[PDB]
From a paper:
The unmodified IMPDH (ori) as well as variants without the native (cyto) or with an artificial PTS1 motif crystallize within the cytosol, but no crystallization can be observed when the protein is translated into the ER. IMPDH crystallized with or without a PTS1 signal (peroxisomal import) in the cytosol, forming thick needles with a square base, similar to the unmodified version of the protein. The unit cell parameters of all IMPDH crystals remained unchanged as verified by SAXS-XRPD. All IMPDH structures show natural ligands at the canonical binding sites 1 and 2 in the Bateman domain. As observed in the previously published IMPDH structure solved by SFX20, the canonical binding site 1 incorporates an ATP molecule. However, we observed two conformations of the bound ATP, where the gamma phosphates of the adjacent ATP molecules are either opposing or facing each other. We were able to identify naturally bound ligands and their conformations in the canonical nucleotide binding sites of the IMPDH ori and cyto structures, at a resolution of 2.3 and 2.4 Å, respectively. The second binding site is unambiguously occupied by GDP, instead of the previously proposed GMP20, demonstrating that crystal isolation and storage can alter the information obtained due to hydrolysis of the ligand.
Here, we present InCellCryst, an advanced pipeline for producing homogeneous microcrystals directly within living insect cells. We have demonstrated the pipeline on five different proteins (IMPDH, HEX-1, Cathepsin B, Luciferase and EGFP-µNS), representing a selection of soluble proteins of different source organisms that crystallize in insect cells in their native compartment or, in case of peroxisomes, readily in the cytoplasm or nucleus of the cells. Importantly, as shown for IMPDH and HEX-1, InCellCryst can produce crystals from native protein sequences, without purification tags or even remnants of proteolytically removed tags, within a quasi-native cellular environment. The rich source of biomolecules in the cellular environment allows the identification of native ligands by co-crystallization at quasi physiological conditions, representing a unique feature of InCellCryst.
Author numbering:
A (entry chain A): 103 to 321, 330 to 405, 440 to 493
B (entry chain A): 3 to 321, 330 to 405, 440 to 493
C (entry chain A): 440 to 493
D (entry chain B): 3 to 321, 330 to 403, 440 to 493
The structure:
Amino acid sequence: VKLYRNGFIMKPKSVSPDVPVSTIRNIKSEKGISGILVTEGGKYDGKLLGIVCTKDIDFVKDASAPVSQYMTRRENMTVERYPIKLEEAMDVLNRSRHGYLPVLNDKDEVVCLCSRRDAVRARDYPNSSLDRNGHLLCAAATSTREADKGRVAALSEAGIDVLVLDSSQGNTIYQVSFIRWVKKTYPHLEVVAGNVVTQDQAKNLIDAGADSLRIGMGSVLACGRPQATAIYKVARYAASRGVPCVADGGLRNVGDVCKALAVGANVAMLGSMIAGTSETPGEYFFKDGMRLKGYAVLDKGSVLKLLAYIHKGLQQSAQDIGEVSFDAIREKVYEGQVLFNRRSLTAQS
Amino acid sequence: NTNLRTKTLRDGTTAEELFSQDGLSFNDFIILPGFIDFDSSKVNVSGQFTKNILLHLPLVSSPMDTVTESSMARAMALMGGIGVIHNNCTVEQQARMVRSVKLYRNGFIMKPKSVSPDVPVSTIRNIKSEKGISGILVTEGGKYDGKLLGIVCTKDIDFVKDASAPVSQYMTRRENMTVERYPIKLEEAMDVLNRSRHGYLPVLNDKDEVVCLCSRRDAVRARDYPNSSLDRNGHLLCAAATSTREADKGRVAALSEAGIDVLVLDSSQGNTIYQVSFIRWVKKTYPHLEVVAGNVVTQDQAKNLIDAGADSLRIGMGSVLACGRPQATAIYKVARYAASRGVPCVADGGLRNVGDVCKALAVGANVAMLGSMIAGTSETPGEYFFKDGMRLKGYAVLDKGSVLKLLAYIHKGLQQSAQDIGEVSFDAIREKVYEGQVLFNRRSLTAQS
Amino acid sequence: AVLDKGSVLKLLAYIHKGLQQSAQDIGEVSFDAIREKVYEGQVLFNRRSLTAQS
Amino acid sequence: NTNLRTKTLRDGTTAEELFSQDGLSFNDFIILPGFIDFDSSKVNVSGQFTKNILLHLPLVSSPMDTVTESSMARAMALMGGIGVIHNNCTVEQQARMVRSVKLYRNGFIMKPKSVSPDVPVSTIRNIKSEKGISGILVTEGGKYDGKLLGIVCTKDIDFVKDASAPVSQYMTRRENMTVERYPIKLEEAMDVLNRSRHGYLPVLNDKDEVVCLCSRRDAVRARDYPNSSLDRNGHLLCAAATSTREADKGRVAALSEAGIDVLVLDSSQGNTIYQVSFIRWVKKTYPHLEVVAGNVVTQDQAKNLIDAGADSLRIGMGSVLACGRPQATAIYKVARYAASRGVPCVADGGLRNVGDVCKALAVGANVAMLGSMIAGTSETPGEYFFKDGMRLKAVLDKGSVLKLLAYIHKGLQQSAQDIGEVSFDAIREKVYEGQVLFNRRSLTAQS
Ligand SMILES: Nc1ncnc2c1ncn2[C@@H]1O[C@H](COP(=O)(O)OP(=O)(O)OP(=O)(O)O)[C@@H](O)[C@H]1O
Ligand SMILES: Nc1ncnc2c1ncn2[C@@H]1O[C@H](COP(=O)(O)OP(=O)(O)OP(=O)(O)O)[C@@H](O)[C@H]1O
Ligand SMILES: Nc1ncnc2c1ncn2[C@@H]1O[C@H](COP(=O)(O)OP(=O)(O)OP(=O)(O)O)[C@@H](O)[C@H]1O
Ligand SMILES: Nc1nc2c(ncn2[C@@H]2O[C@H](COP(=O)(O)OP(=O)(O)O)[C@@H](O)[C@H]2O)c(=O)[nH]1
Ligand SMILES: Nc1nc2c(ncn2[C@@H]2O[C@H](COP(=O)(O)OP(=O)(O)O)[C@@H](O)[C@H]2O)c(=O)[nH]1
Ligand SMILES: Nc1nc2c(ncn2[C@@H]2O[C@H](COP(=O)(O)OP(=O)(O)O)[C@@H](O)[C@H]2O)c(=O)[nH]1
């Protein structure tokens, strides 16, 4: 997730000259990156020798041939010398009509790499959630046991921006200790504690140092809480203390997501609603004349189209409510200017 | 962690407010979570069956002829609960079932089953097949207190082809038997039994007459069932049902002779003059007996039956007659009133899953009565049959397998629920519910989907 | 059309016995008594939630 | 292993006996297994769509306005089948769809899309988004044969914010272009294009005017779809439907100009004087066209339509409602009669799963027409929308038709394997010979 989008591509995937074309095809097929640099000994910081792109090997019949036979050789490559501002480098890339632009030191060793694909990703996805280095934001879940400490470190090395604690009932001493320890050891990390449904639980986990709370429990065990009430109560208390909340569960259509956001949740967690989209894990199969996903659910197509659909739905709902933002809706709900009506059981038909 | 466990915001609804409006069933509300600082294994689910009887496992088998006979009561007692032998039978049958339950587990086995030397092996096989006891003593004239002559065990007759042969032909003879002389402490006797690698150890007087008997099977039962509900003599606890008519007096006596520890009154509406008189008479005549009065659903009824001297109350009525009460409201109200007067209550009815049992115990019931939930387990009365490719029980219900596995499942479920609630015992849950520290939420009809 | 319920006399006796058993469970020996005690607040009720009717 | 494969006991029922009584559907019978000595990968499912057109994949997209337009026909032809563009449109729209299918894949592109230098970038973006072609040539006056001035590709305009700018500002200009001079063999031209690492190679005369254009995308399409149904010039095969009225004559002409290779007559009951006259007129006026007559269900209708000069027959009627025939019987009877006269048949209707398609092909059909089975795939006409959390187009989204066609392919292969023959031509022959046998299933025997 983190290295898909970059400005300057650090540690660019590179190979040695004797590598077979089969390896470059494998790189493109599994990991999906082109423009492989060919360097001294394949080290990502070695002397730049060449580059291998899509059109350089799409015609070759002997997949065992070395890339040096078909790579574009360094003397013929447009390159840049460190230092360079990303803005100038990407304008150079644009003017060059090429897909990639390496940046080298005085010894022709590979310092970094600019990809036109990143420019086009930025153009086609102008609202991407990004960190300060131009990478996509990524969160990761973990339990709060003692072993999971290791996990956290690893994820911190991988570059997660948010840690999310996984628990059906998050108001535990183990989770409080874990939040304290995470904020102490990895101050750069933000933690989403939970799960909770009462303002007690929220108090404990916010006192521990939680930066956000996951609301939901039950959306045979006799313990839980109706989800809309839980969201309103916990989100109100947390907002009084400056902490946003995530609605997690019972979110099955767009009206429910809009309602959950209006009554206090800042963001909404989607599980069932997006399960079976093309981007989820699992293999597709045909059965009974229906496309399904298995380790079953119905194919909903691209998650991108679904996200845009939900976006437009939330916008139209906010419009009908008469406010131009959902922060405004939350503020005016707490203020008593956005109003509701409880529906009798009959009125829901 | 009292700072972390103690709710000050108190975001939720207390039981008193929850049950202040219309009558509720268990699906109408849910329990809110608390604070966890312990593993679910450490949770104590015990509850009082009566003023004086605490059950490690707060579960009681219902006194229906389709649920509780000797076998079910034994299983319940072994898992830490108790069973109520149904009263749809003669006094003699009920007393025999009670005896089956009470003499299954012993320390010293009094009146050990014994036979005379001329008895055929067929008789010993019958004893093992019907009543399930081995290690039959062979004595003078078959009297259980006669001179000890020998012992007959499983391996002594499992190879014999002439079932008419006398046991004296194959019994282990007394001169070769490890025995003990009265007096002896049970501890020393059972250690001797262990060291001897044998299954049985008789205890005799100076005349070699049988005083009593120790069984290794009792040691292994104690090891495999460490939480068994026991009386002070090492026997399994047993309860028995009876109506409150005048004839049933006889029944009571018989059951008292059989050794019941709890008498349970059987009535759809227990707030009657006949039941009040019966409770008075039972407490007067058999002070050692504890009585579970009922059934009731209002605090009026509870007052009358507790004034009569009830040691516990069965709650439930309706879980075409127009009279009854939603079960959760009934449980909360009656259990609160009875607890104010020091009497525990049994939830009887409408208990169909583990969440309902947990809720019923949290809102005031000390123990829960199971009928439908355990009907069709291997230990209930009735014969198994195959039909439509399904195993069913008949005098129909689906086979649920062993009641022991089901009881352990319910135990683990109650423990996990108590953990999620944030209390390490159900007595604690009840106290904190009355205190307003365990909170609830009423669920709209829509919120139950 | 309707299903045969047999004699109305047997049905009336059935309803009679049912009313008697209900009054007994309620704890009053007459329905005039039940009405009086209902107005007096000594015969009590419980409203049933929609769930409690199952 | 002919000794092991050859049935002598012949425990089973032959097709002739099976279809000798009442009219059957596909669920009324099952095919008995034979002898296996091969992998399903080696099974040839190909079938004749017409007397002269063999399809690597015996699948035809139905000419319904909800199933087959240019995109569906392209997918079918690419996977080794073919599509029939529906006739629920004007003649010009149908001809445009046919042209799209025919000019999607080329060797030499003879009429390469061209623009004049003053055209805005927005127009090239529109071309790429609507028609899906890049490497637009910029020539004198925008004529596809004018003097070559430059070329516009993806990376030449992906960064510009002023969409009204002329292409002359950003195009790759002629002086810097790798080009070739007419004449040149396609083999050498495309190898040169490969070595050049570019996406396009114009071919010009001595006057620098555009003769034609080679596209790397065509090479890669040939590599990724080696079994595409193609004509002799490297274009995808395309069929188009038409009614048999007198006005439709015009329609036919237009389609002939657009380059269809097969005409398909649209009628619930094709044994009419109008259809006979239409077939005669088509074979006389446009001999290069092959005609699939229909629809028919009896051998009398087939006799008339074959005498008229039909190259293939569409089977199906009923798969108010008083006229028709159970589809499996119709297929067996008509396909047997037509095969006796050297005409293949298309199964049209009641084909709802892979077992049904396999049965229909085994009992005589050379190819099978797909309608419902492929409705709702990404390549069908219509817009997708969300409802009740399901995505629909109404029918449910089935994803890519290509993956579904591959699924059907593997299914037919595995079925043929279990039957014990390495091709469906062999299966049909052995069915007529009595060496592939069947069993009718009682109504209870169906579960
Ligand atoms: N900085 C560069 N200098 C010189 N040649 C380059 C440079 N970057 C890429 N190339 C070459 O451009 C030629 C065409 O690029 P190619 O199409 O193969 O991959 P791409 O630029 O990533 O775009 P796409 O994969 O979508 O076609 C290749 O031969 C490639 O080696
Ligand atoms: N106190 C004893 N002294 C001598 N022999 C004994 C004594 N108790 C039992 N035995 C004998 O031990 C032998 C083996 O015991 P046996 O297996 O038949 O029954 P068990 O001890 O109850 O165990 P199990 O029935 O499970 O096999 C028998 O011959 C039995 O008579
Ligand atoms: N014959 C040519 N001579 C010189 N430059 C060319 C020639 N053809 C294309 N180019 C240029 O090289 C690049 C063409 O890349 P390419 O043809 O692979 O683009 P495409 O077909 O639109 O798809 P993609 O680039 O994404 O693979 C552009 O910069 C283009 O101006
Ligand atoms: N050549 C090239 N490398 C890229 C591109 N995008 C990202 N990378 C880098 O390629 C690397 C992916 O391979 P790598 O992580 O080293 O292998 P792994 O250790 O098995 O996961 C990462 O270092 C990315 O940063 C690209 O577009 N072209
Ligand atoms: N020999 C033997 N007797 C046992 C054992 N366990 C219990 N008993 C006694 O065996 C007797 C069972 O038979 P009994 O009650 O006398 O016959 P009943 O009057 O028809 O019920 C009881 O007295 C039990 O106490 C055992 O393990 N071995
Ligand atoms: N520049 C270019 N032209 C192509 C390519 N593939 C097909 N064409 C041609 O582009 C033309 C597109 O149709 P056109 O007649 O220009 O538009 P229409 O009048 O609306 O049908 C066709 O003549 C195709 O032959 C390609 O890859 N690059």
